[PDB]
Structures are given as structure tokens and as C-alpha cells.
Design a protein around this ligand. Structure first.
Ligand code: HEC
Ligand code: HEC
Lengths: 79, 83
């Protein structure tokens, strides 16, 4: 349940409904028909992994050309 | 600068340094390392900052989790029930 998921840190990366990982409602939809969904998901919860789910993209941002340049220059200075 | 990045919501998805695992975007230190010394780094990154995109940094991994078999199955069963 949510209380267990919260205790174990899961909710830092997952929401119940549509964070970095897939929302649980979407995981449920994807694996609804899969006979061994519980065994499969239990293994994936314990082991982790990558690339099963498409990544969250970067949206366009509310910045002027000059702000974008300032931000690029600032990021390049983190070294 | 950093304050402008905070103002514009950038830190919702980016940390300065890697290790958190919880942010959707790459750490700024890793962006800086990738593009350092590229002649058009500023103009290239400025464009990406304004427009966004996807595909350059790939997946964010899920780390392994210290849960028992029973806990993992309990969580899986619960997750499958979410509407
Ligand atoms: C706490 C024990 C949990 C539990 C129960 C789950 N997670 Fe994660 N998770 C994260 C990311 C980026 C992904 C995508 C991985 C990929 O695309 O391959 C996932 C994935 C899952 C799933 C789906 C697995 C599948 O094969 O479909 C499930 C059921 C799941 N998680 C449950 C990110 C994170 C975290 C970021 C640091 C952490 C913490 C968790 N997840 C923790 C948990
Ligand atoms: C606020 C204005 C910012 C700024 C300055 C940056 N971002 Fe993001 N970002 C996000 C994701 C998922 C990625 C990876 C995209 C991919 O894989 O292609 C990025 C990427 C970047 C970069 C690197 C671009 C490159 O071509 O290498 C840079 C410089 C960058 N960002 C700066 C996710 C997010 C967000 C999620 C909702 C938000 C908000 C931001 N980023 C905001 C900003």
C-alpha cells in the first residue's frame, strides 16, 4: 500500500496518478493483462533497471534569448 | 546564473550535482562536463534551454531497492490495483 511505498522511499520517484518513474496508474494499465505481472514487477521493484519506460522530456521554457544564454554560460561554469 | 535558474523552475528537474537519482533531467555538472570546450557550447545549450527536447541523455535508471520478496509482491499487487 501507499504507506509501505512511502516508508520505502518509492514515492520520491513515483506518483499514484499521472516525477522520474512511471505513475502507478500507468504501470497498472500496462501490465493489466499480463498473467505473471506480480512476479515480474516484484523482481523489477527489487532490482530496478532502466529503459522499460520512455523518458520524461524537457518542455520548452519561459526564457528570453538573453536569459537562455546566461543560463547556458552559468551551467558551463559548474566544473 | 543559479538564481535565474531557480526563478525559472529549472531546479524542479535539475540538480547541480549527480547522485540524487530523483530528478528527471541531467545534473548541471554533467551537462557542463559533456559540453566543456565545444566552440558553440553556449549557443547550442541556449537553444536547448529555450526549446527543450528529448533523446540526448537517455533513461534515468531505477536503483535497486532494499525490500523483501514479500514486500515487493505486496507492492506489486497494490500497484496493479491503482486506478
Ligand atoms: C519503492 C520500493 C519502489 C517501487 C515499489 C517502485 N519503484 Fe521505481 N522506477 C523509477 C524509474 C526511473 C523507473 C523506470 C525504469 C525503466 O523504465 O526501466 C521505475 C520503474 C518502476 C516500475 C516499473 C517497472 C517495469 O519493468 O515496468 C515499478 C513497478 C516501480 N518502479 C516501483 C524510479 C524510482 C526511484 C528513483 C530514485 C525509486 C526510489 C523508485 N523508483 C522506487 C520504487
Ligand atoms: C530552466 C530554464 C531549465 C534549464 C536552464 C535547463 N532545463 Fe532541462 N532537461 C530536462 C530533461 C528530461 C532533459 C534531458 C533531455 C534529453 O534527454 O534530451 C533536460 C536537459 C537539459 C539540458 C541539456 C540539453 C542537451 O542538449 O544536452 C540543459 C542544458 C537543461 N536541461 C537546462 C527536464 C527539465 C524540466 C522538467 C519538467 C524542466 C522544468 C527543465 N528541464 C528546465 C530547464
Amino acid at each position: 500500500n501507499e504507506q509501505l511505498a512511502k516508508q520505502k522511499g518509492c514515492m520520491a520517484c513515483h506518483d499514484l496518478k499521472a516525477k522520474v518513474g512511471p505513475a502507478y496508474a500507468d504501470v497498472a494499465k500496462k501490465y493489466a493483462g499480463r498473467k505473471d505481472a506480480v512476479d515480474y514487477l516484484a523482481g523489477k521493484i527489487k532490482k530496478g533497471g532502466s529503459g522499460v519506460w520512455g523518458s520524461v522530456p524537457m518542455p520548452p521554457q519561459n526564457v528570453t534569448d538573453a536569459e537562455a544564454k546566461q543560463l547556458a554560460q552559468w551551467i558551463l561554469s559548474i566544473k
